[PDB]
Design an enzyme around this catalytic site. Structure first.
Site, mmCIF file in Angstrom:
data_model
loop_
_atom_site.group_PDB
_atom_site.id
_atom_site.type_symbol
_atom_site.label_atom_id
_atom_site.label_comp_id
_atom_site.label_asym_id
_atom_site.label_seq_id
_atom_site.Cartn_x
_atom_site.Cartn_y
_atom_site.Cartn_z
ATOM 1 N N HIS A 179 3.891 1.308 10.233
ATOM 2 C CA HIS A 179 2.813 0.523 9.568
ATOM 3 C C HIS A 179 2.006 -0.241 10.637
ATOM 4 O O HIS A 179 2.588 -1.147 11.304
ATOM 5 C CB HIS A 179 3.416 -0.388 8.478
ATOM 6 C CG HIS A 179 2.365 -1.128 7.699
ATOM 7 N ND1 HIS A 179 1.451 -0.448 6.937
ATOM 8 C CD2 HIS A 179 2.017 -2.434 7.649
ATOM 9 C CE1 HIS A 179 0.614 -1.301 6.368
ATOM 10 N NE2 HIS A 179 0.898 -2.544 6.818
ATOM 11 N N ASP B 146 -1.257 -2.464 11.231
ATOM 12 C CA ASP B 146 -2.330 -3.325 10.674
ATOM 13 C C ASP B 146 -3.519 -3.384 11.636
ATOM 14 O O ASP B 146 -3.350 -3.835 12.775
ATOM 15 C CB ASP B 146 -1.816 -4.758 10.490
ATOM 16 C CG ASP B 146 -0.814 -4.849 9.347
ATOM 17 O OD1 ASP B 146 -1.105 -4.268 8.269
ATOM 18 O OD2 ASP B 146 0.254 -5.452 9.544
ATOM 19 N N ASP C 225 1.393 -1.366 1.517
ATOM 20 C CA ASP C 225 1.310 -2.828 1.813
ATOM 21 C C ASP C 225 0.238 -3.606 1.038
ATOM 22 O O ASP C 225 0.321 -4.834 1.057
ATOM 23 C CB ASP C 225 1.198 -3.106 3.313
ATOM 24 C CG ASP C 225 1.754 -4.474 3.764
ATOM 25 O OD1 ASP C 225 2.646 -4.998 3.069
ATOM 26 O OD2 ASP C 225 1.256 -4.986 4.785
ATOM 27 N N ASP D 24 7.024 -2.121 10.448
ATOM 28 C CA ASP D 24 5.788 -2.607 11.119
ATOM 29 C C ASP D 24 5.838 -2.262 12.616
ATOM 30 O O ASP D 24 6.823 -2.615 13.262
ATOM 31 C CB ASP D 24 5.553 -4.092 10.853
ATOM 32 C CG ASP D 24 5.102 -4.434 9.433
ATOM 33 O OD1 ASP D 24 5.092 -3.523 8.543
ATOM 34 O OD2 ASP D 24 4.677 -5.607 9.241
ATOM 35 N N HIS E 171 -6.263 -4.778 4.213
ATOM 36 C CA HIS E 171 -5.519 -5.717 3.332
ATOM 37 C C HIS E 171 -5.128 -7.029 4.055
ATOM 38 O O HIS E 171 -4.398 -7.802 3.396
ATOM 39 C CB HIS E 171 -4.334 -4.989 2.672
ATOM 40 C CG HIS E 171 -3.346 -4.443 3.639
ATOM 41 N ND1 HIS E 171 -3.401 -3.117 4.096
ATOM 42 C CD2 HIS E 171 -2.257 -5.016 4.210
ATOM 43 C CE1 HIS E 171 -2.395 -2.927 4.953
ATOM 44 N NE2 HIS E 171 -1.720 -4.093 5.076
HETATM 45 ZN ZN LIG Z 1 -0.035 -4.417 6.351
#
Ligand SMILES: [Zn+2]
Length: 1010
Positions: A60, A62, A174, A311, A441
């Site tokens: 994951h 971001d 997420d 993550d 997000h």
């Molecule tokens: Zn995230």
């Protein structure tokens, strides 16, 4: 076309009806804290019926949260992708899925030519698989559907050009709750399957009990079912390895092989992972297969999905080795031992979905149908995630402004091919990518660190300036005689004027047009209308003199109004009070603009009050007044003590205001009743003991309390074309503006240093709405909500991305927004919407900070009171609602207003009066959401893409030209219906005509030109 009003769809699971039945109890279920102790029949699986298990490695990533995009790229993501390339190349059985194309594109462009070829080969052979393929994994609560499609298009256009692949499976692990806008867009973009994770712990339990975690997700209005997309909801608390092997995280954590050795990680349940050996493999496989068979009891086929990631995982070569080698030793043992009746291997998301549908076609399963949404999310107890519907509201407002500027820049520049030296394509790619990144997000949600928010804001500011440059070059080209047009692509022919962003009380940066009978007696101004129908609207400009008249370029007089320029200031001795400008004035007039077109006007100075320009009166309501000079403005300000006021513009509604300058009633016509409608401001606080509100969570200490207003200063401006009531409240300058129909509401919100406070704006009426209200999803559809007293106040908060309404048998009140904010109806006849929140504490979800970086923001609304007893409404059982004509046009006035342009130089040789007077004026429910040239000037065949959206409006009695987008540009050679991303041709159209779309349908067309 299906009728989306009369017929209620028959589904297995309707989320509003399920919510009304559910008890929402928060019981301790044992090792699966929010479920129960799962049991299975060991004789379910034998030699002739095995469990097939796919372990799907993932990471994951971001695009901004704790670090900026660029900080994470340099410190984490470039190492993840470099190690993926090496490890998949060297280990052909290993697999990996990837979601975020913003990072993948940054990485691939930095590779040498030999590494690019190796990357193409592990994608072509299916080892590295793209899931969704958007620029980001977007928010689903605050995001406009137009921007969800924009970011999907940016990522998928990149993957088609560079990797020659288009994903058909979506991965969304997420986002903080889930919207049916996603299956709507994905199903119209070639998708077959999607996966979601963050739903209410109570919903996971209820669906798991019925094996309804895999479902055919259709739209709330779809009776036939052609919108349906196969959806997999994950069953447990998290997507991390402890919550993905099975129901007991103390067991699953022992199969996260990074949580032993020298990595510095560990298991919170206090039992560490152990290296798999000949000595322990039977014992370790006994515990792991038992977790797999418990998870499989919650689903209907013999094919099981096991995600393996967390993550920013798979950063180090040693992490790839320790995960792959221990799992391979487990697979080799389990596959070789017939008593398990298991086949386990590394796999991809598409591999999982293909195997499930093969099981279905074999007659192994029949899946249930579902309609509805998955808001508002709670991960535990009363911790509902309704805070992020409001956090960082300045950037939420900026999202909607940049959305409109990207649409207008793409449309105005699409009419022509441009020389590469103009850099039009470079500027539009920059703008599309900065807006696309903000859909993440942790972007629009307001859940990033302070320095990360500053990076998003700087990127959006660069995107706005890129759009302005494209727009002004395009307007000059469209309205200058071809005998004269000789462009300098670096030059500013026009400057943009925007009255609503950032707003003159936030940043006093509007250009004053300076006129003088000697030096410069006139100025040309130009309005753009992005909507495909004729529009008339009031526009304003700042001018250096009150003595100004308006004409069209043909010298026909236009009726105008002049008003003073006002600003609001805190008096340190006392009060929040207004100050008048002695140097600049507003000129206000009605512009008439063709569909998708342009109109030119002229502003001219004179000695005195000209014949077709009127002057507003100004009344200051306060005890003990001091003088307010206004320079040359010809009407003296009037003074009085606070009192009730009524206003009417044209033959529109009459509004009455309290002594504090707040609305108290609306009368629709001269004959009709005075209908009570009261604006109020209240405050929510934070709990001194127990869980604290933060960027994600809304945890109020009881119902909201009245704000003490004192005796605030009220300013009444009354004009023939435009009137307003403005009041200076603590933290809010509140304005009601009247132009002859539904009023406009503007709040200048400065929460200052008010720690642990959330400011709410509430409406109170005698509308007998009971427990029912309506809110929109992503600006696309209105969903019926039911207030539930068995849930806490924060659970009855929903996203308000563009509008909300209440109604009874006779009356409806709709509030339309220019920004996404959180809101509710907490009592019969009420609406409320949050303006800003300032929180001193972290809410323990990883952000590691409160929200203490608030700045002034200008929020904008329209307020529509209507009679609905003569409207054809859906039956009481229908889970959708629909706007009226008036409410739909009010929303369009906030999201896509007229654009305004001021000519920069003294003389415009070859100026033309109008562009697009020949454009078709389409039916009011139809929009051209997108117009985008798809080809650069060097292409022998030019291609232009259009997205058409038809909404559904309520029919109320009071009942235009056919729009064919394929014939807007000359020399059309082909017209095709395409996926919404423009990447697949679906139909060669009869007669090169792009047909009429159905109510609630969106379609894409590409026209090809010789
Ligand atoms: Zn995230």
């Amino acid at each position: 076309c299906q009728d989306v009003v009369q017929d209620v769809p028959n589904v297995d699971v309707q989320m509003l009806e399920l919510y009304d039945r559910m008890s929402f109890k928060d019981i301790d279920g044992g090792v699966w804290k929010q479920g129960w102790n799962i049991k299975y029949d060991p004789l379910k699986y034998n030699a002739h019926h095995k469990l097939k298990v796919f372990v799907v490695p993932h990471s994951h990533n971001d695009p901004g949260w704790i670090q900026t995009f660029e900080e994470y790229y340099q410190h984490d993501t470039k190492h993840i992708l470099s190690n993926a390339l090496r490890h998949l190349h060297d280990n052909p059985e290993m697999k990996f899925i990837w979601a975020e194309i913003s990072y993948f594109a940054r990485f691939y462009h930095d590779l040498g030519e030999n590494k690019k070829l190796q990357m193409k080969s592990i994608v072509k052979n299916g080892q590295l698989e793209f899931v969704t393929g958007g620029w980001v994994m977007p928010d689903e609560a605050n995001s406009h559907w137009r921007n969800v499609l924009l970011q999907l298009t940016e990522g998928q256009t990149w993957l088609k050009q560079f990797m020659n692949v288009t994903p058909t499976a979506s991965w969304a692990i997420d986002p903080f709750g889930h919207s049916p806008t996603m299956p709507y867009i994905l199903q119209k973009s070639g998708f077959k399957n999607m996966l979601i994770q963050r739903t209410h712990y109570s919903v996971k339990k209820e669906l798991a009990q019925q094996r309804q975690l895999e479902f055919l997700w259709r739209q709330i209005w779809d009776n036939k079912g052609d919108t349906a997309l196969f959806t997999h909801m994950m069953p447990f608390y998290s997507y991390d390895i402890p919550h993905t092997c099975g129901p007991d995280p103390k067991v699953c954590c022992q199969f996260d092989f990074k949580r032993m050795g020298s990595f510095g990680l560990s298991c919170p349940w206090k039992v560490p992972p152990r290296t798999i050996s000949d000595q322990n493999v039977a014992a370790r496989s006994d515990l792991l297969v038992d977790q797999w068979k418990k998870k499989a009891e919650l689903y209907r086929t013999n094919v099981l999905l096991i995600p393996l990631g967390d993550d920013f995982r798979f950063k180090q070569n040693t992490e790839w080795d320790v995960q792959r080698v221990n799992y391979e030793r487990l697979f080799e043992h389990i596959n070789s031992q017939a008593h398990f009746n298991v086949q386990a291997q590394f796999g991809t998301l598409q591999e999982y979905f293909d195997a499930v549908h093969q099981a279905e076609r074999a007659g192994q399963a029949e899946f249930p149908t579902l309609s509805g949404d998955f808001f508002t999310y709670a991960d535990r107890s009363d911790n509902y995630w309704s805070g992020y519907y409001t956090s960082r509201p300045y950037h939420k407002r900026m999202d909607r402004v940049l959305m409109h500027y990207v649409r207008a820049a793409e449309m105005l520049s699409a009419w022509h091919s441009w020389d590469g030296m103009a850099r039009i394509e470079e500027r539009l790619e920059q703008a599309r990518r900065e807006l696309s990144l903000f859909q993440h997000h942790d972007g629009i949600t307001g859940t990033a660190k302070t320095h990360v928010v500053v990076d998003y804001e700087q990127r959006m500011q660069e995107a706005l300036k890129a759009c302005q440059m494209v727009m002004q070059q395009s307007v000059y080209r469209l309205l200058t005689k071809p005998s004269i047009y000789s462009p300098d692509f670096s030059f500013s022919y026009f400057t943009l004027d925007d009255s609503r962003w950032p707003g003159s009380g936030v940043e006093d940066s509007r250009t004053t047009i300076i006129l003088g009978e000697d030096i410069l007696p006139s100025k040309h101004v130009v309005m753009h209308n992005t909507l495909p129908h004729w529009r008339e609207q009031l526009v304003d400009f700042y001018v250096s003199s009150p003595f100004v008249s308006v004409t069209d370029l043909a010298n026909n007089p236009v009726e105008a109004q002049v008003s003073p320029v006002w600003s609001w200031h805190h008096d340190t001795l006392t009060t929040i009070h207004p100050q008048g400008s002695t140097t600049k004035y507003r000129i206000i007039f009605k512009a008439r603009v063709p569909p998708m077109g342009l109109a030119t006007y002229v502003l001219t100075i004179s000695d005195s009050k000209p014949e077709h320009t009127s002057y507003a009166s100004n009344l200051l309501l306060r005890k003990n007044p001091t003088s307010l000079p206004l320079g040359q403005y010809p009407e003296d300000v009037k003074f009085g003590d606070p009192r009730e006021i009524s206003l009417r513009v044209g033959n529109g509604p009459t509004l009455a205001f309290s002594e504090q300058g707040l609305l108290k009633s609306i009368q629709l016509t001269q004959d009709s009743p005075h209908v009570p409608v009261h604006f109020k401001f209240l405050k929510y606080g934070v709990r001194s003991h127990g869980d604290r509100s933060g960027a994600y969570l809304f945890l109020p200490n009881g119902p909201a309390s009245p704000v003490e207003l004192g005796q605030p200063v009220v300013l009444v401006t009354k004009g023939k074309l435009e009137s307003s009531v403005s009041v200076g409240l603590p933290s809010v300058v509140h304005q009601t503006i009247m132009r002859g129909g539904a009023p406009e509401i503007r709040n200048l919100v400065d929460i200052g240093s008010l720690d642990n406070t959330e400011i709410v704006m509430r409406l109170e009426t005698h509308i007998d709405s009971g427990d029912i209200f309506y809110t929109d999803l992503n600006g696309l559809q209105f969903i019926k909500r039911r207030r539930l007293d068995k849930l806490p106040l924060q659970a009855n908060y929903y996203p308000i991305p563009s509008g909300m309404f209440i109604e009874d048998a006779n009356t409806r009140l709709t509030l339309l927004t220019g920004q996404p904010l959180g809101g509710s109806s907490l009592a019969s006849g009420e609406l409320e919407i949050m303006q800003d929140r300032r929180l001193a504490s972290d809410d323990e979800r990883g952000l590691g900070q409160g929200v203490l970086d608030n700045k002034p923001v200008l929020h904008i609304y329209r307020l529509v009171l209507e009679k609905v007893n003569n409207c054809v409404r859906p039956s009481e059982l229908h889970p959708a609602g629909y706007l009226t004509s008036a409410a739909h046009k009010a929303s369009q006035s906030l999201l896509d207003p007229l654009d305004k342009f001021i000519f920069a130089e003294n003389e415009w040789i070859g100026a033309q009066g109008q562009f697009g007077g020949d454009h078709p004026s389409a039916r009011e429910d139809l929009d051209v959401s997108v117009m985008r040239r798809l080809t650069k000037s060097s292409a022998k065949t030019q291609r232009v893409g259009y997205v058409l959206h038809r909404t559904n409006l309520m029919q109320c009695g009071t009942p235009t030209q056919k729009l064919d987008v394929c014939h807007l540009l000359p020399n059309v050679a082909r017209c095709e219906r395409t996926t919404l991303t423009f990447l697949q041709n679906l139909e060669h159209l009869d007669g090169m005509v792009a047909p009429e779309v159905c109510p609630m349908e969106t379609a894409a067309y590409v026209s090809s030109h010789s």
